[PDB]
Ligand binder design. Structure first.
Ligand SMILES: [Mg+2]
Ligand SMILES: [Mg+2]
Ligand SMILES: [Mg+2]
Ligand SMILES: [Mg+2]
Ligand SMILES: [Mg+2]
Lengths: 143, 149, 66, 101, 67, 213, 134
RNA sequence: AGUCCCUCCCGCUCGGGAGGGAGGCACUCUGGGGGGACUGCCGGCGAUAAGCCGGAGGAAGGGGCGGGCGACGGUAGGUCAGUAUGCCCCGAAACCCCCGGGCUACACGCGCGCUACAAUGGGCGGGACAAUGGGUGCCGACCCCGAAAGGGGGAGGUAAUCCCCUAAACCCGCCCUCAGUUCGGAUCGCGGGCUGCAACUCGCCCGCGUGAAGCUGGAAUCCCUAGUACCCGCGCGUCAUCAUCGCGC
């Protein structure tokens, strides 16, 4: 019954690790969201990931695709109150970075102040820059 | 013997066991989704993290007398790891504790002394000392020096 | 008043702000409601760098002041 | 009876003992019991400051300090003595307060 | 390889920085077994000690009139 | 771990309540009057000896050892390679952790050889203490490196210090622990093996001490 | 008959009471046999083991402490217990062994911390900042 | 603490323990007044003097330990932007008020620090013990709503009474096993709150998610002699909110 490599919704996950860490790899599921889903699904977070039969994979894929309707509350979700509709959503790898990218483009359009910083690759949240954030290369004068 | 006659952790472990049979103690609807205080980082790991909290709360009003909610939140706080800045002490949440005290009240082990907090009942002292004696009647085999008292 | 919060009344028209020395037009469109008025009128001229001078480094500090 | 309670508090220590012994003697001369002056904790107010007007030079500080000595006396009430402790004429750097229980 | 010697008197502090001490030892088992020589030591020393040395013939150079 | 050992009550004034220093026997006549072996149940003196000249003569050897592992490592002088500055996770003041690692160290030593662990220790602290040194003596204008002799007390200090630093470099960023790396050092030094660090340092001191007599 | 003695150790006071009994001894209500930091349990059993399992079985002691930390109250307990034992039995061939093993078991420790001074003033009296030429 | 009543618990009680209330200043404590240490007592240097070494007895020993108090003068050292002040300019202005911006800009060189580069550790559940100080424009016990920040009520306190205030490093039990990792948490997206007349420029706090450099540091250079250095937390100040700082514990 034992296996070495399993896959759930894109990224494939190790099989000699505990179930709660094996899911950490999926971009969009940290550690505190993994404990939750493993509990709600109905199985331990300490079982060896290789021991996952496939109907349980079907269960997990169900949960990750609309978790609010299974018990995962709407204060612990990737993004609440979607800017296009007040629904509360939890996205994962492929859909995630695109959503952030369009949330950035939206600020680039109207030419806000928080969009131009994203343009020029500078701080965004009000830091100081006389002394740190030196992502460049030294300049000389004379010797 | 009493609860003053054994170490705290062994007694709490043994109490939390029998506690699982009182029908009033049962975990609320948001227990699997909560960490215990703004100073932690990860959720509790065992499945019965409830019964340990409640059982530590009994022994905590036995030998502390009239004690109140905002004083059981200083006890269950800790030190925080807040990034690039130094560490600092913080209190704990409220719901996990208020529910525990209301459930122990409904069980019959504590009671609301008005204006001064809560204290333990006779039923509660019987409950705790019976288990303390039950344990100690075996901690003296491997430690033959407790036999005196 | 750069603090004013854009609202569904102001969508469509074009009002001004005051960025310190002059009034700068901000053609209000949807997707602005919620933001602040002064958020669209920047206030410091973007910086472009010349060349280090006498003191920019320990090699030109006392070799100049005699 | 009703056990008046008097509370003296002053910054000069000597000029307190004399009013204390006045009260003690007055009580003694007449017929009344008394609980001797019970010293209460001193309250010392402390103020740390820098020392130089400008900002140049090393940093050196001051420690100013003001101490306030207190006492407490318990005594019964007899008008022969309750009055006798009214012509006592405290000094100007002392505070007195009288109240019964 | 094993020659021990028993200090009887301290003479003073030599050293470029006050480190070494000149001291007059007496050997107690071996070739001399009774002779008295003069040697420099590193560390602290009382009287009655037992140093262990390896030559029994070096005779450190005299010090500046002990002061 | 077992509740019989977690709760342990002695009924004899021994060392740590376990081992008795009645039969150990110091060979070197030089180091005999400095290695103390009195009964002294608990090794803790609360730093009273570090006030009086030659105060550290009458302090139990186990406490002299425990004190010379309450430190962070090599902080301005490399030891076999690198610095090992480990601040905020070093045991500088934590005497409890020190006493614990030394207890477990002895429990391992007693098993892999079979002798009173303090006899093995007193063997280790003689096959690691060298008795020749070097200096510079300025004379009439100039100096030059000359060889000298090391007094006993300083021999003992250097011995224990090198044992410390030897164990405290194999537990560094490596799978082996600290209590067992304090054993793979004493079992070696007490047997004159080259793989040690305390003994090798003695040889490489005595070499460049002899070669410039 | 009863006796009662004292012991202070850098902000920790201890009040002891000694009287006949079965040989048990409590500290704040804890039995001596149950003190977790073993290095602090072996610290208050030195008078009661240096007297023998004969005197240790004809007295009851019960101390109370407050202040300090797990190791600055163990020593207070030890001082009070030694000063009590040297009076109940009231001999001197035992008081002597309380000076060869450790002289402070009866005289206590006169050491306290030392105030802070103004160059860092939160680290200690003698530790300062780091000099900066150039 | 030793006596005296009442209530309640455990092996069912011979013994042990917890609260009250009656009484007492025994012990701790608070703070006024006295005592105690002088090279005084022995041995050795130095003259026999000044004095210096070692030993007793002692709670303490050789300015008892830590602080306050800085001479005549100099430094054309710093401060006219704390107050005072002579001379020269402004005098319908360089004087007095009000709204919005800046001091928070960023190819770059430097000073002082905070967090790490892991096992002399990271996480989760239990168990332990402090002191200085502050509160009436303010400190908030106790009860109830919330997952968390917080919100609605609200005793007692002008103080050895009520409140801030059951500290952290430490210990026991289980997971990880030498890996850019369950190390490291910068940088960013979305949602919920507090102070404020006003949070975009530019305040602070919470929950989920993403997860950068970093594997012990070249020549050089700094601080420390005992309850001192190192390691861990706390309180005042500044303050309507905000401490990686200063001054104390
Ligand atoms: Mg001048
Ligand atoms: Mg000048
Ligand atoms: Mg500035
Ligand atoms: Mg981490
Ligand atoms: Mg803002």
């Amino acid at each position: 019954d034992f296996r070495h490599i399993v896959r759930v919704a894109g990224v494939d996950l190790d099989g000699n690790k505990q179930l709660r860490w094996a899911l950490t790899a999926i971009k969009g599921v940290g550690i505190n969201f993994a404990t939750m889903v493993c509990r709600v699904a109905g199985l331990d977070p300490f079982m060896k990931a290789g021991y996952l039969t496939d109907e349980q994979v079907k269960k997990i894929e169900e949960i990750l695709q609309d978790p609010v309707a299974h018990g995962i509350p709407r204060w612990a979700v990737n993004r609440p109150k979607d800017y296009e509709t007040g629904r509360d959503l939890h996205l994962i790898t492929a859909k995630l970075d695109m959503a952030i990218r369009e949330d950035i483009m939206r600020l680039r359009r109207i030419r806000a102040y928080r969009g131009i910083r994203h343009e020029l690759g500078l701080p965004v949240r009000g830091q100081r820059t006389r002394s740190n954030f030196r992502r460049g290369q030294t300049v000389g004068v004379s010797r | 013997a009493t609860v003053y006659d054994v170490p705290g952790d062994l007694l709490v472990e043994r109490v939390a066991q029998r506690l699982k049979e009182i029908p009033e103690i049962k975990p609320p609807e948001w227990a699997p989704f909560v960490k215990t205080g703004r100073h932690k980082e990860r959720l509790p790991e065992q499945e019965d993290w409830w019964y340990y909290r409640v059982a530590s709360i009994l022994r905590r009003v036995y030998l502390d007398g009239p004690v109140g909610i905002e004083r059981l939140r200083t006890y269950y706080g800790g030190r925080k790891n807040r990034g690039h800045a130094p560490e600092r002490f913080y209190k704990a949440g409220g719901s996990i504790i208020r529910k525990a005290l209301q459930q122990l009240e409904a069980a019959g082990f504590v009671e609301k002394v008005p204006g001064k907090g809560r204290v333990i009942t006779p039923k509660g002292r019987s409950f705790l000392d019976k288990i303390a004696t039950e344990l100690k009647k075996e901690l003296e085999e491997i430690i033959p020096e407790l036999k005196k008292y | 008043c750069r603090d004013m919060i854009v609202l569904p009344e102001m969508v469509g028209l074009t009002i001004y702000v005051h960025n310190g020395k002059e009034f700068v037009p901000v053609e209000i469109k949807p997707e602005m409601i919620g933001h602040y008025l002064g958020e669209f009128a920047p206030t410091r001229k973007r910086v472009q760098h010349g060349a280090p001078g006498i003191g920019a480094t320990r090699s030109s500090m006392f070799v100049a002041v005699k | 009876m009703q056990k008046a309670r008097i509370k003296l508090a002053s910054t000069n220590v000597r000029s307190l003992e004399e009013v204390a012994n006045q009260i003690k003697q007055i009580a003694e001369r007449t017929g009344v019991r008394m609980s001797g002056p019970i010293p209460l904790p001193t309250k010392r107010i402390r103020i740390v400051t820098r020392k130089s007007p400008d900002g140049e030079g090393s940093a050196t500080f001051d420690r100013w300090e003001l101490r306030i000595h207190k006492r407490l006396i318990d005594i019964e009430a007899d008008e022969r003595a309750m009055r006798q402790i009214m012509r006592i004429r405290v000094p100007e750097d002392v505070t007195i307060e009288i109240e019964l229980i | 390889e094993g020659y021990p010697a028993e200090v009887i008197e301290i003479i003073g502090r030599t050293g470029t920085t006050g480190d070494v001490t000149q001291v007059k030892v007496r050997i107690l088992e071996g070739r001399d077994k009774g002779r008295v020589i003069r040697r420099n030591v590193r560390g602290p020393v009382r009287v009655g000690d037992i140093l262990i040395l390896r030559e029994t013939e070096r005779e450190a150079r005299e010090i500046k009139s002990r002061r | 771990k077992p509740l019989s050992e977690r709760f342990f009550i002695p009924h004899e004034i021994k060392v740590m309540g376990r081992w008795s220093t009645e039969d150990v026997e110091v060979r070197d006549p030089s180091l005999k009057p400095y290695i103390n072996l009195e009964p002294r149940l608990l090794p803790h003196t609360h730093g009273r000896h570090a006030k009086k000249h030659f105060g550290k003569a009458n302090v139990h050897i186990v406490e002299r050892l425990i004190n010379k592992i309450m430190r962070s490592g090599g902080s301005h002088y490399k030891v076999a390679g690198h610095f090992m500055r480990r601040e905020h996770r070093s045991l500088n003041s934590k005497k409890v952790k020190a006493y614990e690692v030394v207890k477990e160290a002895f429990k391992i030593i007693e098993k892999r050889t079979g002798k009173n662990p303090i006899q093995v220790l007193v063997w280790a602290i003689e096959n690691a203490a060298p008795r020749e040194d070097t200096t510079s003596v300025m004379f009439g204008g100039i100096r030059y490196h000359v060889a000298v002799d090391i007094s006993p007390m300083r021999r003992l200090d250097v011995a224990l210090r090198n044992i410390a630093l030897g164990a405290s470099a194999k537990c560094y960023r490596t799978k082996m622990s600290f209590a067992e790396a304090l054993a793979e050092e004493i079992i070696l030094a007490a047997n004159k093996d080259p793989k040690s660090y305390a003994y090798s340092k003695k040889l490489e001191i005595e070499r460049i001490a002899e070669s410039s007599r | 008959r009863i006796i009662q003695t004292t012991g202070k150790r850098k902000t920790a006071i201890a009040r002891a009471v000694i009287r006949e009994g079965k040989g048990r001894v409590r500290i704040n209500g804890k039995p001596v046999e149950l003190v977790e930091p073993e290095i602090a349990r072996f610290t208050i059993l030195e008078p009661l083991i240096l007297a023998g399992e004969e005197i240790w079985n004809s007295v009851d002691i019960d101390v109370k402490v407050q202040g300090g930390g797990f190791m600055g109250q163990a020593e207070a307990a030890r001082i009070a217990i030694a000063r009590a034992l040297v009076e109940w039995t009231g001999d001197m061939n035992l008081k002597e062994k309380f000076i060869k093993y450790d002289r402070t078991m009866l005289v206590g420790d006169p050491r306290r911390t030392e105030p802070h001074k103004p160059n860092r003033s939160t680290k200690g009296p003698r530790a300062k900042r780091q000099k900066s030429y150039r």
